[PDB]
Amino acid sequence: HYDVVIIGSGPAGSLCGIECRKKGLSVLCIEKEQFPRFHIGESLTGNAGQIIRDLGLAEDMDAAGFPDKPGVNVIGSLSKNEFFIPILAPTWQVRRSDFDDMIKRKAVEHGVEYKLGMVTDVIKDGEKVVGALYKADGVEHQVRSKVLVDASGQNTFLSRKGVAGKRQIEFFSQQIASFAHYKGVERDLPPFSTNTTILYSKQYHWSWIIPISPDTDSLGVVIPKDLYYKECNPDDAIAWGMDHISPELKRRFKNAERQGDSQSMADFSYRIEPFVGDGWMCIGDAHRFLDPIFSSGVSVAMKEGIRAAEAIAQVVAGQDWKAPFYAYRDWSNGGQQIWADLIRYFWIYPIFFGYQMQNPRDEVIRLLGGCCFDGWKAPAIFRNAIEEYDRK
């Protein structure tokens, strides 16, 4: 028996476990993969940076060789339009295998119990979730929980089991990402050498370059699903990007040497509703995924883990789940909708978006730093333009 059982130990599950422990709750985290393990999504927001400082991890970040992130340089190729989004507060580019392991060790330090295992089923008592089944070695185990937290990322465990809602996928923005790590990439000149670079051409055609260590850079090429299936495996997709997205690519990778195989993965934005219920909740990618063009996923996952523990504590302490879980739900929907709007606005009006950075700018900087979860003008501008556009 535990107060809280967390499925998965990415940024959402790890932060949820840490904050649950800070509220004095007993916590079991079941994670199916042995750490450290590779994972994509390497560029952090200023707000993720602040959580990391709060955990007391800043020195360890520098020690791990994670480059400082000055901001993101966005370059459009069809018109050479270029803009730079400065970082809100100091943050980093990370190798996720090592980063996720660091956060996980902090969770263990706070007294989270970990099991290597794959959660496979929930245990119900009528409508109520009261625990879970998981496989470790050759063997099925049972655990009982007051709240089962699904932090399974894009595995969307509770959705797949029909406990949570079905995925509602955004049909018009379906993309496939292909990526690999390289050495020998030409970096921007200081003070910008370790910025994230985003290159885009047509709508939903884009690429990233992220320095993740002193010598290594992550390259991604992201294109519409149909184009990928039509003209492209992940090697071919990356080559297509090198050829068609921007000349900056062939230039910077002139002397680059790939480390390890390339990979592809769905980049479909989705949302799952409901994502809270009696005895359970979802946090992070387990209920919602946004186009990672602005590198917000880890920041969002961490924030949701933190905010969920608040709700969880109230329920473990005897309050009916509705008021607290619905407050979490509404808080999450509020902030995620702002991110979603920013992204849709960018894809519709990428040039107008950029120029916004010369407009007396501060709001967007804060928003892209992650301040999306707390009167600002920007959210309404994005919302209004998108509604008009859709109506048109």
Ligand X SMILES: Cc1cc2nc3c(=O)[nH]c(=O)nc-3n(C[C@H](O)[C@H](O)[C@H](O)COP(=O)(O)OP(=O)(O)OC[C@H]3O[C@@H](n4cnc5c(N)ncnc54)[C@H](O)[C@@H]3O)c2cc1C
Interface residues with ligand X (CB under 6 A) are 7-13, 30-33, 39-44, 118-119, 151-153, 155, 157, 177, 220, 265, 267, 284-286, 292, 295-299, 301
Instruction: Give the strand pairing for 27-31 and 113-116.
Output: parallel
Nearer to ligand X, 193 or 319 (CB): 193
Write the CA distances from 109 to 22, 55, 85, 346, integer angstroms: 11, 11, 35, 41
Smallest separation, CB 301 to ligand X (Å): 4
Write the CA distances from 91 to 71, 239, 303, integer angstroms: 9, 31, 15
**Amino acid identity, residue 19?**
E
Smallest separation, CB 309 to ligand X (Å): 14
Smallest separation, CB 13 to ligand X (Å): 6
Nearer to ligand X, 283 or 313 (CB): 283
Neighbours of 227 (CB within 10 A): 17
Smallest separation, CB 75 to ligand X (Å): 17
Smallest separation, CB 318 to ligand X (Å): 28
Smallest separation, CB 380 to ligand X (Å): 25
Nearer to ligand X, 174 or 385 (CB): 174
Q: How far is CA 251 from the centre of its chain?
A: 29
Write the CA distances from 379 to 140, 218, 347, integer angstroms: 47, 31, 15
Nearer to ligand X, 139 or 318 (CB): 139
Nearer to ligand X, 313 or 368 (CB): 368
Q: Tell me whether the omega of the peptide bond preceding residue 190 falls within 30 degrees of 0, making it cis.
A: no
Give the count of alpha carbons within 13 A of 168, CB side only. Answer: 7
Residue with tokens 């791990």: 64
User: What is the C-alpha to C-alpha distance for residues 384 and 290, in angstroms, rounded to an integer?
Assistant: 20
Q: Which residue lies nearest ligand X, judged by its C-beta?
A: 10
Smallest separation, CB 295 to ligand X (Å): 4
Give the count of alpha carbons within 13 A of 33, CB side only. Answer: 15
DSSP string, 73-106: EEEETTT--EEEEEEEEEEEB--HHHHHHHHHHH
Nearer to ligand X, 13 or 211 (CB): 13
* Assigned token pair, 25: 């709750």
Nearer to ligand X, 32 or 307 (CB): 32
User: What is the C-alpha to C-alpha distance for residues 270 and 125, in angstroms, rounded to an integer?
Assistant: 29
Nearer to ligand X, 337 or 385 (CB): 337
Smallest separation, CB 54 to ligand X (Å): 17
